[PDB]
Amino acid sequence: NYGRGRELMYQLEKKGKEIKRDLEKILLSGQARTDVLADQYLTNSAADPA
């Protein structure tokens, strides 16, 4: 431990949150709204037959 000493690799808390530039694209992308709840979200037809 005489060389690398940048906080003992405590990174990924800031300057490294690049996930934001992927979230931005996910929002401004033309992906569908696929789901499994039959688009109702409140089926509850005798204890969620699904």
Added chain:
Amino acid sequence: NPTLFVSYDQNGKKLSFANWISVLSPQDTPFVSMTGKESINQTIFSWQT
């Protein structure tokens, strides 16, 4: 039906175990106990000569 109660009918013992253990395995490490130690940063290192 005893009449003397001599060190055998005494129920409810405690076993008077000891408070140590004898690890007789050989732990003698003279080379290690003699050679010093040094904190290294990375896995790989070097020394000049």
